[PDB]
């Protein structure tokens, strides 16, 4: 009967600082610990530090010590993990978890479901949508493939839909690309009939949040 | 500092094991914890104070600690426990602090070799029109999701300009990749042919694109 539930994804500059909450139901004032993991992509779990309930002192890790800060308001049942002075190497997952019981050396029974910080020297550019079109190199066995490339957009995620929504069975978007740039592209594909294509009108709904740009574009042969 | 194997196989209905390996002033003096995690979501704890399995968790999970390492256990394995597997304990020298393992990663055997399906698309005529060029080769559908990609001008490799992605799994259990080629118009242009080639489990799948002929 009790959840815990970090703040948005952030995207960072080299240098600057970064300050992600965790809001817990149940509580709200606490008699548990609460601790700070990160996790680097493809790495194993890495402890940065908890803070004690009640006497609020902190704990942390060695290699944060010094640049992380850990605190909570109690009168709202929220804790702040702050990190200074970033570097690329910050990028991970960052989980906020309690433990079963009031101590940081004790196991951590609940978990939030995490939240990214990008650490980035590029700044937010929105995409450019390309049609992926047909034509005969794709048309075999009365399918064909068809497409939209959404090339240097910063940062993720993007959004891609077909036909304002209604075409969904029959349709991939693949994970993006990061280029030496910096800057993100992804494709997503959408396979059909062979027969509907010249009939038929195909539209892909691309949506950057990030960059308030939304980008409708027919794809056709 | 506590060190697991990095992966660990078996069929399913079988039993596993997952070894840790720790010194005295970790695993030897405090309980170990195991949690997994599978992707995309939050690790759950699995097993708690050595040996102990907390309310909500199958039976088939069973916890293990002698001297200096600990082993997890899981036994009548369903496909739905392939997920990355971490050991966690407390550091009780003067760091003082929370360390956890490498993780390993269990996989389940057994799913049919997939032959890959490849899509390559040429750079469309509005971008080469912005004075830039993308080649595009979309690999779906194949198992197990290993693939390697190589291009080609012409006749002849070309390693310039080349972006690949980790392969994925999707949706349906079977993997995904792309591979992006950037080049100039006056490059694009200035060839007979592109190929973007596959390969994948010792046999090769390859698509060819020309300057619209």
């Known amino acids: 009967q009790v959840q815990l539930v970090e703040s948005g994804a952030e995207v960072k500059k080299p240098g600057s600082s970064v300050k992600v909450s965790c809001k817990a139901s149940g509580g709200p004032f606490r008699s548990y610990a609460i601790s700070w993991v990160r996790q680097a992509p493809g790495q194993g779990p890495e402890w940065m530090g908890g803070?004690?309930?009640?006497?609020?002192?902190?704990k942390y890790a060695p290699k944060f010590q010094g640049r992380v800060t850990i605190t909570a308001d109690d009168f709202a049942g929220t804790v702040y993990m702050e990190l200074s002075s970033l570097r690329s190497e910050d990028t991970a997952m960052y989980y906020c978890?309690?433990?079963?019981?009031?101590?940081?050396?004790?196991?951590?029974?609940?978990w939030g479901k995490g939240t990214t910080v990008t650490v980035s020297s590029a700044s937010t550019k929105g995409p450019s949508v390309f049609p992926l079109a047909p034509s005969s190199k794709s048309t075999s066995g009365g399918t064909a493939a068809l497409g939209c490339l959404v090339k240097d957009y910063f940062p993720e995620p993007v959004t891609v839909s077909w036909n304002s929504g209604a075409l969904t069975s029959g349709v991939h978007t693949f994970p993006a690309v990061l280029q030496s740039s910096g800057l993100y592209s992804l494709s997503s594909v959408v396979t059909v009939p062979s027969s509907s294509l010249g009939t038929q009108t195909y539209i892909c709904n691309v949506n950057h949040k990030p960059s308030n740009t939304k980008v409708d574009k027919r794809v056709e042969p | 500092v506590l060190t697991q194997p990095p992966s660990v196989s078996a069929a399913p209905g079988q039993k596993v094991t997952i070894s840790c390996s720790g010194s005295?002033?970790?695993?030897?003096?405090?309980?170990v914890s195991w949690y997994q995690q599978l992707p995309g979501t939050a690790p759950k704890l699995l097993i708690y104070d050595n040996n102990k399995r907390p309310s909500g968790i199958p039976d088939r999970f069973s916890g293990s600690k002698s001297g200096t390492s600990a082993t997890l256990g899981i036994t009548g394995l369903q496909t739905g426990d392939e997920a990355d597997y971490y050991c966690?304990?407390?550091?009780?020298?003067?760091?003082?602090?929370?360390?956890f393992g490498g993780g390993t990663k269990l996989t389940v055997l057994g799913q049919p070799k997939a032959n890959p399906t490849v899509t390559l698309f040429p750079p469309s005529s509005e971008e080469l029109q912005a004075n830039k060029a993308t080649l595009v080769c979309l690999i779906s559908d194949f198992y197990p999701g290993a693939v390697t990609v190589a291009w080609k001008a012409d006749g002849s490799p070309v390693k310039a300009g080349v972006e690949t992605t980790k392969p994925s799994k999707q949706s349906n259990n079977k993997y995904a990749a792309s591979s992006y080629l950037s080049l100039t118009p006056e490059q694009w242009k200035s060839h007979r042919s592109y190929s973007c080639q596959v390969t994948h489990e010792g046999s090769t799948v390859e698509k060819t694109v020309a300057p619209t002929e």
């Open positions: 005295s002033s970790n695993i030897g003096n405090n309980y």
């Open positions: 966690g304990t407390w550091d009780s020298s003067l760091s003082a602090y929370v360390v």
């Open positions: 978890a309690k433990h079963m019981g009031y101590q940081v050396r004790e196991t951590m029974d609940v």
């Open positions: 803070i004690i309930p009640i006497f609020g002192t902190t």
